[PDB]
Symmetry: D3
Subunit: 253 residues, 6 copies
């Protein structure tokens, strides 16, 4: 297994003892994803990508963070939806910080933080900064971290044309995530429940408290009507290949 949770402490210790072991931590969220998909999507996708990348490059995968930062209207629909269960920023930051501190204690020095929930980004960044500050105080400056959101690896316009024949800041519960889920966890997707509505549009600013009227009723920012397993397989291949390459580049054996 590539999952740290499924290893004995002796197996884990042996792996870290190699001195060049790469650890990966999926960071997601429990968030509404429309009428057609489950709420753990942001955990499932990065965990699936991590699993495959780890198998491909020989890394290990830490237990994923199941709860993330508050859902924002323009990226996740808004934190007023039922089901969505969010943490305060300080809580998420402290979790990332504590884990890095512990990995450093083990002797590990390479970590990939794979985000699957857009809103988590800056809180993961602060967690990394605070942890690295402490490590320096402990006399450790050789701990290296690579942070990324798996979905940022699908930029190639060529690939985009394939996913959107008819032609990113509106891909919550849409074609992208739904396609990936159809390729990975089809049993957790019910396409017949998709509400085919027009893409959500927003002015160049944000309003608080969140106004429910500004988010499409289903909670999705765009329709997943044209999602497919074929598209998900393409997305999966692009992400896994790209991320695996980045890791080989940043953490060579």
């Amino acid at each position: 297994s590539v999952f740290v949770g499924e290893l004995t402490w002796k197996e884990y210790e042996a792996r870290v003892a190699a001195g060049d072991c790469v650890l990966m931590l999926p960071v997601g969220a429990l968030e509404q994803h429309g009428h057609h998909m489950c709420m753990n999507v942001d955990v499932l996708l990065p965990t699936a990508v991590c699993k495959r990348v780890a198998e491909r490059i020989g890394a290990l995968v830490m237990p994923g963070l199941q709860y993330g930062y508050k859902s924002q209207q323009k990226s996740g629909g808004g934190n007023h939806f039922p089901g969505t269960t969010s943490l305060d920023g300080a809580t998420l930051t402290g979790t990332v910080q504590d884990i890095i501190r512990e990995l450093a204690r083990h002797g590990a020095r390479r970590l990939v933080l794979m985000n699957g929930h857009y809103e988590n980004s800056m809180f993961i960044v602060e967690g990394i900064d605070l942890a690295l500050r402490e490590l320096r105080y402990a006399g450790i400056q050789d701990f290296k971290v690579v942070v990324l959101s798996y979905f940022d690896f699908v930029k190639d316009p060529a690939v985009i044309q394939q996913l959107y024949p008819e032609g990113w800041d509106i891909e919550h519960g849409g074609v992208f995530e739904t396609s990936l889920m159809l390729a990975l966890y089809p049993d957790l997707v019910d396409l017949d429940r998709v509400v085919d509505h027009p893409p959500a549009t927003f002015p160049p600013y944000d309003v608080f408290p969140v106004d429910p009227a500004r988010t499409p009723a289903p909670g999705t920012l765009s329709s997943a009507k044209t999602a497919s397993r074929e598209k998900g397989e393409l997305i999966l291949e692009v992400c896994v290949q790209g991320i695996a390459d980045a890791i080989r580049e940043e953490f060579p054996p």
Copy 2:
């Protein structure tokens, strides 16, 4: 599904709209469990118990907390072992607090926290208190929480005897109890042949910090799991599930 994570928000909303929906939250840890078992035991076990209880009483299971408080020498071997990845007290407390705040926002009012890592106890308690305090400021005083550890529902002497025929002796970390449950639920994550059959750990009537590695058995286990078995696990599982299910029925009546 009984797992909230596998439900769409409408399926979840529909259940809570009932008025007496019961939610369960597994709280575990990533901690060394000897040479014979994997490190996610404290998460796997409470989750498996929650799932079965949920199926029998019609409750829902929230995503489990994967990381818990620092492993203590006398209960989990110590936080000096590799693999064990622990949170500071404030972090765990804050996570529990945030989750309760959100569930209340959803309209839920019944929560069962099932702890699988001994050391988590008081931080789960503080998280609950701080959340309940805030709920009161929001005008909510009808949110009820039940906190329990599955390993506390096994008291029947007849059962204890079957589990420990050689005599019942706090030393269970990585021993017969957890190993048997794992053999029944996740046999592929256990290799009894790697078990180190050392005598139960004994400690002085106090604690020392920084933790002294010499005071913890080398394998990390506090007792031997040599006599662990699938059969014992099946017994423990059914006993805990039935006891917990009945307890929930009593505290959260339809």
Copy 3:
């Protein structure tokens, strides 16, 4: 008098809020390196200048600006390893925003526009807003409304982008110390800009991931993400008018008389 709250007596401020529909604006910036050709308080100066003009135009008031913001990130500000850049931890910035909102609510104010001038501040401003609103709710206050925006998000008209980047536009994710900010500075504070010191290097490019601790080798030596060689006061005057007009219209829409 002035639209700056700091320049009003408490009686003047009280009278304004007593109107019941008074709009308050808070600029949020940073002290951060901006290359060899510009000063380091740009992120405070620009949103403050925009707030000033918008407030005067629509009849709002401007609160003292936050001079220090969140840690500079490599891909958006060059990185927090640079000398001069003086950053706050996330909790500190969040808490400052949270405290200000709590106090404005105490005064009786119920309308606030947060104008961000430093990209990295965004989510911490958001958390500060959320935590404050949560507290207001506990206090029995649910009519406080906040609008948060980055003045640079109001320049979209392709006709404008064309004039600003006749040679072509390569995204805004590289506008740190580039044509946009430098042009605004040339139009507002020309004395704090010296174009002859601009290093005309090609636009910085990055992979779709971040590395920590920050690697100095991945940021252009000058600290800028793109060259401001083609910056001008004319472009700045265009940017300024489009931003002021756009933000003023947005506030009129969200905070009607």
Copy 4:
């Protein structure tokens, strides 16, 4: 002069730590209801009295005790719904322990014994210790050693338990306001105990789980978890001597001359 740090001048304290092997002791208690027969500062008084006696025998010093502890839990202290009980949040107690350790390290001390008199304090004391030791490590200090204990754990001799509970032993789980604590008070502070007010009732029994908010109906009315009817000064003297010599010997072994 005195074994209590608070009763020493800074010069006397300085001289004692300058020896290089000084052992410091910190009593950690609480202000909590202890039934109708005893006062509410028991959790502070007892560990302080035990520390004093141990200190006189080993040549240690006793720091001012922490008067406020963590929230009383139903199954161990009756519950935090009782009047009088005045509890701190976990972070507050943790921070207090952490701050004191940091200061003692500053003084040059490197040996500390924390004697907890309030069960609920345990994990927060442990966290305070860990956070302090982490900080000390960052400061280049790794020779600070801490021992944490409770006098309860030093009463294990069968011959002793039999003398204390001639009618059977049920464990320390239901001792709150019972025989053990009341007997010690009768021996040390007889004037703060009115045994004639003890409300006799069977030992508290609870299901294998906890409920929040705390349900007052699940705690015996008087607030005690067991009856102190059979408590006595004689039992208190026995417990005291047994705990003092046991703790004194534990300290000698962990902090050798």
Copy 5:
């Protein structure tokens, strides 16, 4: 019965609060060096003794005192570089005060007097009170009233000042370990004061600013900011009676029956 809450059973405490007009008092001190002639717990001992006497006269109750206070400052307490002085971080003291007020409110109490014996604690006590009152407001409680004071401020009668300082009065600024505190200690705790050890040095003088890290050379070697050579039991008794009667009347005025 006793005026100390810690010495009451919860039943006795509940009855007193049930009256509806019960006043509670909380002494706040510190463990701090007090020269070569006095013990280090002076800041907690004095306010506790004054609270006790005030309470016996007005029928109030006294809570366990806070033994640890904020960091000693050079110009008020000598500096936090001295051995023995054991100080808390500001957040810790603030949180302790906040937690206690929250709990007293839960009890049903609505009147609190905080008597500070350590100058440096003042602002953290103030913040603790504000945060607690903010929370009470969120809980729907706005009738909790707090009075904060120090016995020092009740000694202003020229006639009394002359008797205490017949050679001249320079103010409270240099009183740390001086005539005022030492005289009170001589009248209340003679066993904890060894006047023969006093170092008769002139009043400490400092420049119009502070330096950090603290410079030990700027504090008189003994730790005192003025000489207690002229201190006496007689002056102590005078100070005590004046303070007790002044504080007692202040409380009657602020918390009318």
Copy 6:
């Protein structure tokens, strides 16, 4: 040529710091009501102006000032119940000071002067400094020195106090919005003062204790603690020159090459 860090490029700042012996100055103020005759940013404006002039004479640099300070207290600033006054929680202010010192240390700076213009900020600035210095030590830095002061403390010469208060001096305790600040504003920012609006009331007097929640009836209606009727540009010019050379000389003494 400017002494303001915000108006320098990172290269110019880097050279000044790398040159060694660079003294940085940080103004810390507040947004607080200052009567009917003055604006609310006085506590920020004055220390910034003093710092600028001192910096120009000794070759120091001035950091962007902190615009928001700690809650106004009744006896020093009138109270935090006034509209306009916008205050931070203590932890927020301390964290801001702490983050700034950490960053300056990262830059390589080791000399900082904090000039406080809002009395209530003092202890939180102190805690910010201590927490920052603690961290620097963990980073292996023990040569960072901080000076904290207030221009108020540099006006002591009786000859000066004479010309300022020819009718008698009572102390700084009642100066909020009075002669001192108003005179400085008249000399530096006349357009932000309208002496005709001054309410000539007698100096505020308070009982020897504080009450919370704050009682509005105990603060003079205008918000001022004393009358600024006798304020003048001439007095302001005198105060300014006295403070500038006094502070300049103090810095030269504490920070020699």
